[PDB]
Write a structure and sequence with these properties.
monomer; 84 residues; alpha+beta; two-stranded antiparallel sheet; 3 helices; 6 strands; flat; binds zinc ion; DNA-binding; Zinc finger and BTB domain-containing protein 20
DNA sequence: CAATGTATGGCC
DNA sequence: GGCCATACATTG
C-alpha cells in the first residue's frame, strides 16, 4: 500500500503517491507564460490557464449557467437538487 | 501514464 | 454563489 510517512496517508495507486511526494519538495517548475505564477504539478497549471482564457466550458443542462471548473458545476447541481 | 471526475475551502 | 487552487480518485 503506497503511503507518505510524513502525512501518514495512503494512496490507491503509485501515480498520486509520486505526485504527492514531489509536492513535498516545494519545487514549482511549471510556470504560467502570462502571469509567471509557478505550480507544483502541470495539472494545476492546466487548470490555471482558464483564468486567462475565460472559457467557461462547464454548463448546467438545467438552467444553462456556465462555470470555470467542473467542481463548481458539481457544487451548483446541489441547488437544483432538493426538487424531486 | 493522461484524461477526467470528485471534493474542499478561502476569497471576492 | 462561483472563482480558483489544491488534492485526491477512477478510467482508458
Ligand atoms: Zn505527505
Ligand atoms: Zn497565469
Ligand atoms: Zn443550473
Amino acid at each position: 500500500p503506497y503511503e507518505c510517512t510524513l502525512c501518514n496517508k495512503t494512496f490507491t495507486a503509485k501515480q498520486n503517491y509520486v505526485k504527492h511526494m514531489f509536492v513535498h519538495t516545494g519545487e514549482k517548475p511549471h510556470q504560467c507564460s502570462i502571469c509567471w505564477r509557478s505550480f507544483s504539478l502541470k495539472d494545476y497549471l492546466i487548470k490555471h490557464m482558464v483564468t486567462h482564457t475565460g472559457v467557461r466550458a462547464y454548463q448546467c443542462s438545467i438552467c444553462n449557467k456556465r462555470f470555470t471548473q467542473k467542481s463548481s458545476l458539481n457544487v451548483h447541481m446541489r441547488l437544483h437538487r432538493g426538487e424531486k
